[PDB]
Amino acid sequence: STPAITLENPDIKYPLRLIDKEVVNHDTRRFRFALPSPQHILGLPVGQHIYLSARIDGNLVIRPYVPVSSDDDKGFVDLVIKVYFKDTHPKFPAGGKMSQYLESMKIGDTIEFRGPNGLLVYQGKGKFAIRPDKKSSPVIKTVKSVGMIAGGTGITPMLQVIRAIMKDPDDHTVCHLLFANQTEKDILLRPELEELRNEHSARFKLWYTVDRAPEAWDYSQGFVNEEMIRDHLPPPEEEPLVLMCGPPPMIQYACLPNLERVGHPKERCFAF
Numbered sequence: 558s559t560p561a562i563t564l565e566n567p568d569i570k571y572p573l574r575l576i577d578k579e580v581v582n583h584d585t586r587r588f589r590f591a592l593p594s595p596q597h598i599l600g601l602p603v604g605q606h607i608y609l610s611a612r613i614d615g616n617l618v619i620r621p622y623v624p625v626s627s628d629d630d631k632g633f634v635d636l637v638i639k640v641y642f643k644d645t646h647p648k649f650p651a652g653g654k655m656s657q658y659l660e661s662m663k664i665g666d667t668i669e670f671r672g673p674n675g676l677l678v679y680q681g682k683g684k685f686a687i688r689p690d691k692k693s694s695p696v697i698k699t700v701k702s703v704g705m706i707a708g709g710t711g712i713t714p715m716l717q718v719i720r721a722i723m724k725d726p727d728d729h730t731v732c733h734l735l736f737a738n739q740t741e742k743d744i745l746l747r748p749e750l751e752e753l754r755n756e757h758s759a760r761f762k763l764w765y766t767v768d769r770a771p772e773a774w775d776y777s778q779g780f781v782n783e784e785m786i787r788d789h790l791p792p793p794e795e796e797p798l799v800l801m802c803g804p805p806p807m808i809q810y811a812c813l814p815n816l817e818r819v820g821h822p823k824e825r826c827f828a829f
């Protein structure tokens with residue numbers, strides 16, 4: 558028999574109870590929610606995300622988040638979410654709606670989950686099923702290596718895929734991650750990433766850039782650029798899939814032009 562599935566229907570909302578919150582850094586936390594019983598699984602293909610929804614201040618608010626847990630995990634789901642606080646940034650006095658609602662939840666409070674959703678599914682052993690859009694059937698891309706460019710919380714879909722690969726000893730796909738954040742203290746999930754490197758260095762290449770670097774720094778500095786792509790992702794002739802996820806300007810100005818300069822074609826690139 559197979560475990561009971563939480564997300565049985567993508568149009569149903571499932572209220573899940575918050576059970577734990579763990580600090581990732583000054584503004585980011587892992588939020589762990591209980592599934593309907595301890596034996597359930599979420600029901601989420603690798604590559605997919607969920608949506609959270611709530612009535613915040615009298616208006617329904619819906620936002621997507623990528624679980625970093627998997628269908629191997631019985632009884633819980635983990636999200637890694639950056640909180641955009643009010644009364645902090647001069648351009649954003651109110652902060653972010655959903656992320657502060659989440660930050661304010663008490664353990665035992667519920668929030669509605671729905672899913673799965675997304676254009677990409679990782680089918681294992683280098684196989685990716687990618688829809689060109691939400692109005693098209695998937696096509697299955699088969700690769701030996703995967704470049705991953707993440708900015709900030711854009712790490713979450715990358716980590717979800719990395720974890721899926723590394724746990725299968727017969728999955729020979731090599732992941733090359735280039736992870737960009739504003740400062741060293743903004744790096745998310747660093748111990749794991751470095752733990753994954755320590756354990757799986759033949760399948761996992763790790764590199765960082767930060768917008769402003771500290772004095773003691775052995776990685777790159779600045780926005781993602783041509784040189785970083787050329788040095789820290791597989792080269793075009795090895796026909797990798799290049800996955801990217803981060804702020805819209807990151808994608809538009811740092812990733813797309815520089816991917817084109819290196820020679821990774823559109824049709825081998827995917828933005829979460």
Ligand SMILES: Cc1cc2nc3c(=O)[nH]c(=O)nc-3n(C[C@H](O)[C@H](O)[C@H](O)COP(=O)(O)OP(=O)(O)OC[C@H]3O[C@@H](n4cnc5c(N)ncnc54)[C@H](O)[C@@H]3O)c2cc1C
Nearest residue numbers: 620621622623638639641642649652653654655656710713
């Ligand atoms: C498919 C998908 C999956 C996603 N998965 C994740 C995920 O796994 N983890 C995750 O954390 N996010 C994820 N996001 C983003 C997420 O959906 C929300 O957009 C995010 O949580 C912000 O929503 P909000 O309602 O808090 O902010 P909103 O109220 O919608 O917006 C406020 C915006 O103002 C800016 N802002 C406000 N206050 C500050 C501040 N103090 N400092 C800097 N900027 C500020 C930010 O740009 C912020 O997004 C994902 C996005 C997509 C498209």
Ligand SMILES: NC(=O)C1=CN([C@@H]2O[C@H](COP(=O)(O)OP(=O)(O)OC[C@H]3O[C@@H](n4cnc5c(N)ncnc54)[C@H](O)[C@@H]3O)[C@@H](O)[C@H]2O)C=CC1
Nearest residue numbers: 708709710711714737738739780803804805806807811829
């Ligand atoms: N589609 C998905 O599955 C997911 C999407 N995301 C998105 O990722 C983003 C994460 O935002 P934050 O963590 O707040 O990022 P952030 O604002 O802290 O920026 C992270 C990095 O993005 C790059 N970047 C930012 N502005 C740039 C610019 N003007 N030019 C070039 N590069 C720039 C920089 O390298 C920076 O260090 C959000 O937009 C979020 O919606 C997050 C998780 C998953």
